[PDB]
Chains A and B, each alone.
Chain A
Amino acid sequence: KAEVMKEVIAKSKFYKQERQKAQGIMEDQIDNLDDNFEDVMSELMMTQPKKPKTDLDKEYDIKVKELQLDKRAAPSDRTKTEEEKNAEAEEKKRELEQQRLDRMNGMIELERGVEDLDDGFWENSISCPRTHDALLDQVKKLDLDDHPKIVKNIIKAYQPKLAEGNKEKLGKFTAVLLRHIIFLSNQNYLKNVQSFKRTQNALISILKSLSEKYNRELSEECRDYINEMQARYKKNHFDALSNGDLVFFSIIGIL
C-alpha cells in the first residue's frame, strides 16, 4: 500500500511538473509571438482585401419595430387553489401563533432569553412632511374629514419604487403620522365627533399599513413620546396627561 501510494504521489508530482513545463513553453511562445506582432500585422494590413440581407433577416427587423410600437401585456402568476391558499394561510397562522407563545414564555428576538437581559441591570406636487408641523401646513386649509385623503396621497406619491430614498421618507412619515393622530385627539372635537371619528380611525388604519413596513421608524418615535411625556409628567404631573396620551397608548396595543 505504501509503495503504491508513493508511486501515486510520484506520478502526481511527475504530471504536475509536466504541466508546469508545458505552461512555461507556452508563455515563451506567447512572448515570442508578441515580439513579432508588429511585423505580422504590417503585412496583413497590406494584404487587407478591398471593400443582400436574407428574408428571415428582413422579417426580424420588421417584427422588432412593430413590437416596439405595440403595447405590452402585464404578466400574471398561476392561481393557487382555495385549498392551497387556506393551507398556506393556516400554516402562516400556526407559525405566528407559535412565535407569540415563545415570546410570551421569555423568547427575545435580537433567540435570547429574559434571563440573559437580567445580567447587570440591578448592579447599575405632493410634499412629504418630514416633521409634524410640515404635515399641518399641507393640511392646514383642508377639513377634518380630509386628513385621510391627503395622508394616503402622500404615501402614493412617495412609494418605494417611484424613487430612491422614498422608503426613508415614508419611514419618517410613519413617525409624523403617529404624532398627527395623537395631535388631533388633543384638539377639541365635541362639535364634530362623527367627523373626527371618520378621520381618527382612518389615520390609524394608514398608520397600521405604515407600521407593517416601518415598524422600526414607528418604534423610535413611540419611545420618544414615552420619554417626552415622562418628562412632562415630571414637571406638570396630571396636567401633562391629556386625551392624546390615552389615545397614544391604545395605538401601541393596536400596532
Chain B
Amino acid sequence: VTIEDALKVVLRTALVHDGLARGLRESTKALTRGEALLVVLVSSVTEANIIKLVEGLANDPENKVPLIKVADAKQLGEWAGLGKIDREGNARKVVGASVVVVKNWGAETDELSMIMEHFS
C-alpha cells in the first residue's frame, strides 16, 4: 500500500463523514480554528504564495498539523470528490483542488495508521 493509495481511501472516508474542508478558504478557516488534523497540499500551484501561507499556518507552534505533498491539483480534487463519474465510470469534469484539509477521520482504518506512522 503506497502512501498515495493510503490517502485516497482516507480522503474518501473523510468525505463520508463531512470531515474535509475543500478549498483554500475552507482550509485556512479550519487551520485557524484548530480543527485541522491533516493538510494535503499541491506541488504545482502556480502562485508561490499559496504554498508559503498554507505551510506557515500548518507549522504554527500552537497547532502543528502534518503536511503532505501532492504532485497535481487535479488528482487531489478527484480524491476530494469534486469530480463526476461517467457512464464508463471514469471521473469527468474534475475540478482541481489546490488544498484539502481533514477535520474528521470518520472511521479508524489501517491506512490512517500508516500515514500517522509515516509522520511520526
Direct A–B contact in complex, judged by CB atoms less than 8 Å apart: yes
Chain A residues with Cβ below 8 Å from B17 are 61
Report how many residues on chain B are interfacial, defined by Cβ distance under 8 Å.
Answer: 10
State whether B85 touches A68 (Cβ < 8 A): yes
Count of A-B residue pairs with CB < 8 Å? 19
Measured CB to CB, the closest approach of chain B to A186, in angstroms, equals 45
State whether A62 touches B16 (Cβ < 8 A): yes
Bound form: Cα–Cα A185–B87 in Å: 44
State whether B85 touches A61 (Cβ < 8 A): no
Measured CB to CB, the closest approach of chain B to A165, in angstroms, equals 20
A191 CB–B CB distance under 8 Å: no
Measured CB to CB, the closest approach of chain A to B42, in angstroms, equals 22
Among A62, A68, A69, A71, point to the contact of B87 (Cβ < 8 A): A71
Measured CB to CB, the closest approach of chain A to B18, in angstroms, equals 6
Bound form: Cα–Cα A5–B118 in Å: 91
Chain B residues with Cβ below 8 Å from A72 are 85, 87
Bound form: Cα–Cα A74–B86 in Å: 11
Within 8 A of A (CB), among B8-41: 12, 15-18
B89 CB–A CB distance under 8 Å: yes
Please give me the residue from chain A that is nearest to B18 by CB atom.
A61
State whether A65 touches B89 (Cβ < 8 A): no
Within 8 A of B (CB), among A64-103: 65, 68-72, 74
B81 CB–A CB distance under 8 Å: yes
Measured CB to CB, the closest approach of chain A to B41, in angstroms, equals 23
Interface string of A38-80 (1 = CB under 8 A from B): 0000000000000000000000011001001111101000000
Measured CB to CB, the closest approach of chain B to A153, in angstroms, equals 22
Measured CB to CB, the closest approach of chain A to B24, in angstroms, equals 23
State whether A71 touches B16 (Cβ < 8 A): no
Please give me the residue from chain A that is nearest to B84 by CB atom.
A68
State whether A68 touches B81 (Cβ < 8 A): yes
State whether A65 touches B15 (Cβ < 8 A): yes
State whether A71 touches B89 (Cβ < 8 A): yes
Measured CB to CB, the closest approach of chain A to B52, in angstroms, equals 32
Interface string of B80-92 (1 = CB under 8 A from A): 0100011101000
Please give me the residue from chain B that is nearest to A58 by CB atom.
B17
Bound form: Cα–Cα A61–B106 in Å: 12
State whether A71 touches B18 (Cβ < 8 A): no
Chain A residues with Cβ below 8 Å from B89 are 71
Chain A residues with Cβ below 8 Å from B15 are 65
Please give me the residue from chain B that is nearest to A63 by CB atom.
B16
State whether B87 touches A61 (Cβ < 8 A): no
State whether B16 touches A69 (Cβ < 8 A): no
State whether A65 touches B81 (Cβ < 8 A): yes
Among B12, B81, B85, point to the contact of A70 (Cβ < 8 A): B85
19 CB-based A-B contacts, threshold 8 Å: A61-B16, A61-B17, A61-B18, A62-B16, A65-B12, A65-B15, A65-B16, A65-B81, A68-B81, A68-B85, A69-B85, A70-B85, A71-B85, A71-B86, A71-B87, A71-B89, A72-B85, A72-B87, A74-B87
Supplied contacts A61-B18, A69-B85, A71-B85, 9 more A-B pairs, CB within 8 Å: A61-B16, A65-B16, A68-B85, A70-B85, A71-B86, A71-B87, A72-B85, A72-B87, A74-B87
